[PDB]
Design a protein around this ligand. Sequence first.
Ligand SMILES: Nc1ncnc2c1ncn2[C@@H]1O[C@H](COP(=O)(O)OP(=O)(O)O)[C@@H](O)[C@H]1O
Length: 442
Amino acid sequence: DWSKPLPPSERLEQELFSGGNTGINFEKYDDIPVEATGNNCPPHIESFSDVEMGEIIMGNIELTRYTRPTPVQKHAIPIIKEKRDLMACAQTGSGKTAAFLLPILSQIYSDGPGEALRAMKENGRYGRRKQYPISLVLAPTRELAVQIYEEARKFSYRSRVRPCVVYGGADIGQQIRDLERGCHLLVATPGRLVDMMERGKIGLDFCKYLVLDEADRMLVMGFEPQIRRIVEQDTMPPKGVRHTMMFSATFPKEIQMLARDFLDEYIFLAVGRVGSTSENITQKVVWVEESDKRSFLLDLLNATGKDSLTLVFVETKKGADSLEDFLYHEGYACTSIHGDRSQRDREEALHQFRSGKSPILVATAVAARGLDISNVKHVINFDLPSDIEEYVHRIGRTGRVGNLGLATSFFNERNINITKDLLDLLVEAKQEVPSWLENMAY
Ligand SMILES: Nc1ncnc2c1ncn2[C@@H]1O[C@H](COP(=O)(O)OP(=O)(O)O)[C@@H](O)[C@H]1O
């Protein structure tokens, strides 16, 4: 039924596999180790043939030119196939996307869509009420959300499963109409999925496969609330019933606590460094009285040069303004993220920060919550937050895979509380620790 592939189509098969020509770095990954922790963990696999992937998957794997499974894909696939929860850490290019889509799809085709859906299509309840995805993949940004989606279209070619993606900063009405056309594997970004839900367009009652792609990156952009609203606060099946998978390069305490509540008797999969923060990111904490702050920032900027971008965080919108004011006044090409405005207009203001025009960007925690501010070499904490949690996804905005970024933070009496946590964080990340910091912790 859901296992026996439907008749092909050239026009469609052409659209989905436009040559591709893109293959993963298949030689500099086999050099990286893959540790798998957990009880009675299902033994990894060598070839996609080491487990019944079903007709359709095996078929589509060919049309996408995949010979054998990447490293992570060697341990991930059999883990998901034997229906075990998973927390996986691996750097981009590892082949994470295919690692969760394949086994998941292979399962739907195998097990079918569930009796709820089955006995709901054959029920004269025709129309466009509410769609219930069988699998949900939460993603941090529209860029990645769509890549995943594209990937799903390929692997779900010639099956009863219609993939569908939604995200913010687009006409919701259009996306809503797209949902109405079919949902089985919905890929979405936290905020939008919640919006769709409130609008009664999506239901999570029959979601059996939950995947949080780049959980750490999602939290950075301040999504935790929705993620929990989505998972814990709704019609979604509890753990043990639904199968969950988390994917994230870094493994901070806020992700450990997330993997804790969401995953169930899960296997930890790490293919490299167990980073508490991004491996490639430098942290310099310096003591600066409030008065000396602006001048200190200025010296910091003159040095900046580098034809790089600088993201400057402050604590209040009030000061984000007076500082943005101060910086324009001193003759600096800087802009400011508007909190109030929609994230559609906000993703616009960044279009000019990006092209050099204004290498300086001053924003508060809130104001950027939701935005994908990438391409930033220097993140400076003009003010520090109350929690070391915030600190983490604040310095997160920099050091994106490939090149190293810098995160300078001004620290003074005003935040002696977050002392001990900041110290530990630096010890862990093996950063330089100011003697005065150690002293002010007892
Ligand atoms: N097992 C594989 N064999 C050959 N190519 C693969 C395999 N897995 C992924 N790829 C290729 O790598 C690309 C995906 O890389 P990707 O999975 O998106 O890295 P990441 O998981 O960090 O985002 C795809 O376009 C695909 O063609």
